[PDB]
DNA sequence: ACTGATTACTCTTTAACGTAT
DNA sequence: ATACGTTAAAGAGTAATCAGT
């Protein structure tokens, strides 16, 4: 039971988790709202996940990350709690990945740029052209998350598939009209 | 409405011979003018929400049968509006464009009105709305869910005051 | 009165799907 | 494969209510 014991929280690292939340609760909530959002953009974490896990309101949340819409300390604490825990989950997600022993896919900005330029060359890409974009996009989402491309399976639902690539061109071609 | 019982068939029959995007911009203009929510459409007609919005706003095509259900509702709808304004679905209020520039203009003059300013602004907004729908401002009870009230003016100025954040 | 916090509702956007070649 | 025609899901904007100042 080695890996699951890493997974368990050492009492000291638990006090660190709680300490970080208290620190942010004394910082500018607008300042911490930026980084929560930017992190949610770095890993393309739907707010619905936060709304589901936290118990907050999508609008109050959306308002609080898009604008400096204030929110009471108790509710912000839940967001801050979820934040520090998710950091560990995504860390393991990638770490415990690449080896063998209900979120929706969302196109990341880096991949989007890759795809747009490719659409200019050939709007209806060959299957091999499509696959070569998958890895190139996967790598870009990997380096955007600061992880090695090897741990691409950690992207989870945000893992680019050849089917998803073709769809992008398909919908974007469908948007020609 | 037997006098026009088949006129409406002629309307929808015309409309479906008509260009799809043209009739789509038309109903949206109609909905925007009377501030009718797309919900009520989706509720009565039964077409998919996303499809309707993607069609009324961008030109996404749909089958004539589904298109006919919209046209049938559009023709129908005209009757209730005119009949109800003449008479003089818990839909939610929505501010109409002419009413906003009125309220916005009043904003710079006074961020925090008092009661008498709010209620005078009411009628002014109810005017423009009745005018925007080509009906005498006397028939404002027909605006119904879109009838401006004082509490709404306070809420408007309130919410617009929270803009600072 | 009013700020303040909070929310149900409405709708545009998005990725995905099936059908009929 | 491709085009369509169609849509569940995600999020931001809108109007609103309750309560502590």
Fold and architecture overview:
Two copies of one chain form a homodimer. By secondary structure, chain A is mainly α. Chain A has two domains: 8-95, 434 Repressor (Amino-terminal Domain) (Orthogonal Bundle), CATH 1.10.260; 109-174, Homeodomain-like (Arc Repressor Mutant, subunit A). Chain A is built from nine helices and no strands. In chain A, helix 2 (11-25) packs across helix 6 and helix 7 (109-121) runs antiparallel to helix 8 (127-144). The longest helix of chain A has 23 residues, at 73-95. Chain A is globular and about 55 Å long. Chain A starts with a helix and ends with a helix. In chain A, 21% of the residues are buried. The A-B interface holds A 67-70, 177 and B 59, 165. Chain A binds a DNA duplex (21 and 21 nucleotides) through helix 5 and helix 9.
């Amino acid at each position: 039971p080695i890996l699951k014991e890493l997974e368990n929280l050492s009492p000291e690292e638990a006090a660190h988790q709680k300490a970080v939340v208290e620190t942010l609760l004394q910082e500018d909530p607008w300042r911490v709202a930026k980084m929560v959002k930017s992190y949610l953009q770095q890993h393309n974490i739907p707010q619905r996940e936060v709304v589901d896990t936290t118990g907050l309101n999508q609008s109050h949340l959306s308002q609080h990350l898009n604008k400096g819409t204030p929110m009471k300390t108790q509710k912000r604490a839940a967001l801050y709690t979820w934040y520090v825990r998710k950091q560990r989950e995504v860390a393991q997600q990638f770490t415990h990945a690449g080896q063998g022993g209900r979120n929706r896919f969302k196109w990341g900005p880096a991949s989007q740029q890759i795809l747009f330029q490719a659409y200019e060359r050939q709007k209806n890409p060959s299957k091999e052209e499509r696959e070569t974009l998958v890895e190139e996009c996967n790598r870009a989402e990997c380096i955007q998350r600061g992880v090695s491309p090897s741990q691409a399976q950690g992207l989870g639902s945000n893992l680019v598939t050849e089917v998803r690539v073709y769809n992008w061109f398909a919908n974007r071609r469908k948007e020609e009209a």
